[PDB]
Amino acid sequence: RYEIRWRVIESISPDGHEYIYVDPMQLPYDSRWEFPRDGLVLGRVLGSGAFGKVVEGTAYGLSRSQPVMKVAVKMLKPTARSSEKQALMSELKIMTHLGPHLNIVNLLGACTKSGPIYIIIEYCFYGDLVNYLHKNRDSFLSHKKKSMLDEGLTLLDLLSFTYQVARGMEFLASKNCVHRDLAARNVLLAQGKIVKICDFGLARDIMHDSNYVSKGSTFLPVKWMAPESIFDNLYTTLSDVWSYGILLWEIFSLGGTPYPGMMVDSTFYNKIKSGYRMAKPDHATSEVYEIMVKCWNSEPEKRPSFYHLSEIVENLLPGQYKKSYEKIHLDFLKSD
């Protein structure tokens, strides 16, 4: 049952109600990513799920800038079915198609012969944003109080996370890529407080995860899904924009649960159909809440694009933030 959530839209109708996803099986794989298993040392498990895990590792000779490099490694469980092994390959093709960006968890290499499949990816020291925000809750709170009366976590960090996710999603959307599970649990934080969007599905157990709900064959992240996804099974980049607003609510609640205290049941769905939206989280500014509400337009075409969101949020960031971000993004693309 493992497969990546992400899809690439091959073609879409003018209205946008019909589309075709690229079938990764159609694409050939070039082995530009192949890396000798002997150049990899594996360490401790970083996350473990129903059909695979992600492990910390060190790669020797994988990078020219960093001949000794800390990495993460994705791999299936021992029982894993052939179909899912193919899903790992598909993931390799999709990443190759996207190419690099500062704010996604990037592919670095792969071991696909003479052993189990390994996907070598960037290591994100701080883990996922939910856990990071929970652990730094009281530090943010303390900063807020000091600011009120006059190394941690600040409002500038929260706006930086907001911006970097918008930039990573603008990149995916620019590639006709739809994430379909955008949420704080799928945003990792690297050293330097660089946020990196991913699909951490391999390392979760979907059946026991209360962020997902059964429908039919699968488990869906209903509280992050746009109404046309919930009701009509449609997922486009504009659906992701809805998810992005839900993610912002998680960020500015410092890792709160969306629709807190509401269970996904018939009354939940009826409230959504009636136009219910979440209230402002405690630590959102009014501008930030305005951004969320725009993302939650019932009409997909009225939602802002990720380019427009990146532009809006840049207006909330000090001019020098943008200049550091652009330098770090440059440094990243020049690496190796």
CB distance 121 to 111 below 8 Å? no
Contacts of 335 (CB under 8 A, 6+ apart): 63, 65
Here the contacts of 85-91 (C-beta below 8 Å, separation 24 or greater) are 85/117, 86/25, 87/2, 87/3, 87/4, 88/117, 88/119, 89/24, 89/29, 89/117, 90/3, 90/4, 90/24, 90/25, 91/4, 91/24, 91/119
Q: Locate tokens 């959102």: which residue?
A: 284
The answer to whether residues 59 and 71 touch, using CB atoms and an 8 Å cutoff, is yes
C-beta separation of 175 from 98 below 8 A: yes
Facing residues of 188 across strands? 128, 196
Token pair for residue 293? 């509400």
* Residue 306 assigned as binding residue: no
HSE at residue 206, side-chain half, CA atoms within 13 A, is 20
φ, ψ at 104 (rounded to 5°): -120, 155
Q: How many degrees, rounded to 5, is the angle at CA 290 between CA 285 and CA 293?
A: 130
Query: Has 48 been labeled as part of a binding site?
Result: yes
3-state secondary structure of 32: coil
DSSP class of 154:
-
In the chain, which residues are followed by a C-to-N distance beyond 2.5 Å, i.e. a gap?
150
Q: What is the number of other CB atoms lying within 10 angstroms of the CB of residue 118?
A: 21
State how far the Cα of 50 lies from the Cα of 185, in Å rounded to an integer.
17
For residue 208, give the DSSP letter: G
Is residue 46 part of an annotated ligand binding site?
A: yes
49 annotated as a binding-site residue: yes
d(CA 234, CA 21): 12
Q: Is 53 labeled as ligand-binding?
A: yes
**What is the three-state SS of 5-31?**
CCEEEEEECCCCCCEEECCHHHCCCCC
Q: Please name each of the domains of the chain with its CATH number.
A: 1-123 (3.30.200.20), 124-319 (1.10.510.10)
Residues classed as catalytic: 181
196 CB neighbour count, 10 Å cutoff = 23
Would you mind telling me the total number of residues written for the chain in this entry? 336
Q: How far apart are the first and last CA of the chain?
A: 36
Q: Is 54 annotated as a binding residue?
A: yes
How many Å apart are CA 87 and CA 39, to the nearest integer? Answer: 24
Confirm or deny that 70 is annotated as ligand binding: no
Rg from Cα positions in the chain = 20
Separation of alpha carbons 217 and 229, rounded Å: 15
Task: Please provide residue 107's backbone torsions phi and psi, each rounded to the nearest 5 degrees.
Answer: -75, 135
